[PDB]
Each structure stands twice: as structure tokens, then as C-alpha cells.
Amino acid sequence: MIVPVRCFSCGKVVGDKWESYLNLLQEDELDEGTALSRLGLKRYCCRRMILTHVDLIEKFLRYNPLEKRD
Amino acid sequence: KPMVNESDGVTHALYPQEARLRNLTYSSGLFVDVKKRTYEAIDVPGRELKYELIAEESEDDSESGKVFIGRLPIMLRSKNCYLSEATESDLYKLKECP
Amino acid sequence: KYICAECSSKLSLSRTDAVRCKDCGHRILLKARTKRLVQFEAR
């Protein structure tokens, strides 16, 4: 499920930063805290938004709405 | 392996998606060999009956010897089921949840 | 109109035709969404 566009608490916008955040994690091999602070996420609620996100859109995408089995 | 015969008499392997959507029953068929023997004796009063082999029907040399006996349900992912050896792409193209 | 379930082939079926796909021969057929978008008000 694609990243929330806005922060549920302070109204800020975090939706656009997900793509750039993923870059710092393996291209620059940085840790999670410094990467989170590199993008201006300073309140811990924005860090909560980005840090604990389960990206489920890459699993539905390998799939079709037609013929799942059980 | 599990399979289904439609009302038209056509036979096709049954997969869990079709069983789920079409309200079928995931099951397979059981085949058992059967042999028959007939013995005949002369009933002489006061004497023990001595039967002798005369006729023995055994079709082990032909595919007609397998008597169909019934249908048995199959539990998912067991040895017989098609899902046993499916890889991730196999599960996706058949549309399983990994 | 309808659509196949494996190859999603575009098919049209009458009220008497068999419910099958012409190319793959499957027995599972899906509808097609209303081509003309219709506006609504949620009440």
C-alpha cells in the first residue's frame, strides 16, 4: 500500500520523500536514524510515518484481479 | 492427481482456483485391483466337499482391471496436490499467496 | 461484452451462446466496466 501522502499528526508531507529515502539506505549505506534526519524529519511523528511503513504495493503488482486460488 | 469431469463428459485437471470460484470439491479418484475365482465341487452326502479351481478372472494385464471405487478429498499442499512443488513464480501465475 | 479470465480476451456473448472463451476455452468469464462513466451523488 503506497506511502501516505501526509503525516497524520503534524500535517506535514512525507509522500514525496520515500523514493529519495530508499536511495540513502543502500546507495550510501547509511543507518536509519541519520537517513531519516537527512530529509528534515525532526518531529518523531514524521519519523514514525516513514520508519514503520510496510510497502505492500510491490506484491499486488505481480498479480492480477482475475484468478487467485486457495 | 485431482481432476474433474464436466457435464459434457470432458476431463480436465482441477485446480484450487476453479474449485473455489465454481463451488467444486477438491478431490481425486481411487483405483483398486479386483480378482475373481469360481470353485465347483460335487456335493456327495456324507463326504467333505472338494472344490477345484476352474475359472479365475484377473485383468492385471490390461488397464480394465483397475476398478474405480470412489473419490477421496485432498488436503492442500500434501504430496498429491499440484501445489507441493510450486515455486514463487509458479504460485503467482496460478495466483497463490506465497 | 465480457472478458476472458486467463488471457483477458475481448468477447461478446448472446443470451443463448455457451459461456466459454473462444481462444482458451475456459469456463470463467468476467464482465466489463460501464464504458460510459456515470456521475452520482452519495445520499
Which residue of C8, C20, C24, C28 to mutate against B (max B Cβ within 10 Å)? C28
DSSP string, A11-28: --B-TTHHHHHHHHHHTS
Please name which of B33, B28, B88 lies closest in space to residue B66, comparing C-alpha atoms.
B33
Question: Looking at the DSSP assignment, which residues form a beta bridge with residue A6?
Answer: A13
CA atoms within 13 A on the CB side of B9: 0
Q: How far is residue A1 from each of residues A5, A26, A55, A56, C17, measured CA to CA in Å? A: 12, 22, 5, 5, 41
Question: Looking at the DSSP assignment, which residues form a beta bridge with residue C10?
Answer: C3
d(CA B83, CA B77): 5
All cell numbers assigned to B33: 485391483
Q: Provide CB contacts within 8 A for C14, sequence distance 6+.
A: none
Residue that is written with C-alpha cell 506465497 in the block: B98
d(CA A69, CA B94): 7
Rounding to the nearest 10 degrees, give the CA dihedral for residues B15, B17, B20, B22. -80
CB contact under 8 A, B95 and A68: yes
How many angstroms separate the first and last alpha carbons of chain C?
30
CB contact under 8 A, B15 and A63: no
| Residue A46, domain extent | 1-66
d(CA B90, CA C5): 17
CB contact under 8 A, A63 and B76: no
Q: What is the DSSP letter of B64?
A: G
Domain count, chain A: 1
Q: Provide CB contacts within 8 A for A33, sequence distance 6+.
A: none
A65 Cβ under 8 Å from any chain B Cβ: no
Q: How far is residue C13 from each of residues A26, C2, C32, measured CA to CA in Å? A: 53, 7, 12
B94 neighbors A69 (Cβ within 8 angstroms): yes
C28 Cβ under 8 Å from any chain B Cβ: yes
Domain count, chain C: 1
Listed resolution, Å: 4.6
Please name which of B1, B75, B10 lies closest in space to residue B31, comparing C-alpha atoms.
B1
Residue C18's domain is classified under what CATH number? 2.20.28.30
From chain C, the residues in CB contact with A66 under 8 A are 5-6, 8, 30
A1 neighbors A7 (Cβ within 8 angstroms): no
- Given CA atoms B95, B96, B97, B98 in this order, what sign does their dihedral have? negative
Q: What is the 3-state secondary structure (H, E, C) of C3-37?
A: EECCCCCEECCCCCCCCCCCCCCCCCEECCCCCCC
Chain A residue closest in CA terms to C31: A66
B10 Cβ under 8 Å from any chain C Cβ: no
SS3 B85: helix
| Residue C15, domain extent | 1-43
d(CA A58, CA C2): 28
Q: Provide CB contacts within 8 A for A61, sequence distance 6+.
A: none
CB contact under 8 A, B97 and A68: yes
Residue C8 known to bind ligand: no
d(CA B15, CA A70): 9
DSSP string, A3-68: PPSB-TTT--B-TTHHHHHHHHHHTS---HHHHHHHTT--SHHHHHHHHT----HHHHTTS-SS--
Pairing type for strands B52-58 and B27-33 reads unpaired
Q: How was this structure determined?
A: cryo-EM
Please name which of B14, B96, B71 lies closest in space to residue C26, comparing C-alpha atoms.
B14
Residue A56's domain is classified under what CATH number? 1.10.10.60
CA C13 from centroid of its chain's CA atoms: 8
d(CA B81, CA A36): 47
Backbone angles phi, psi at A34, to 5 degrees: -70, -35
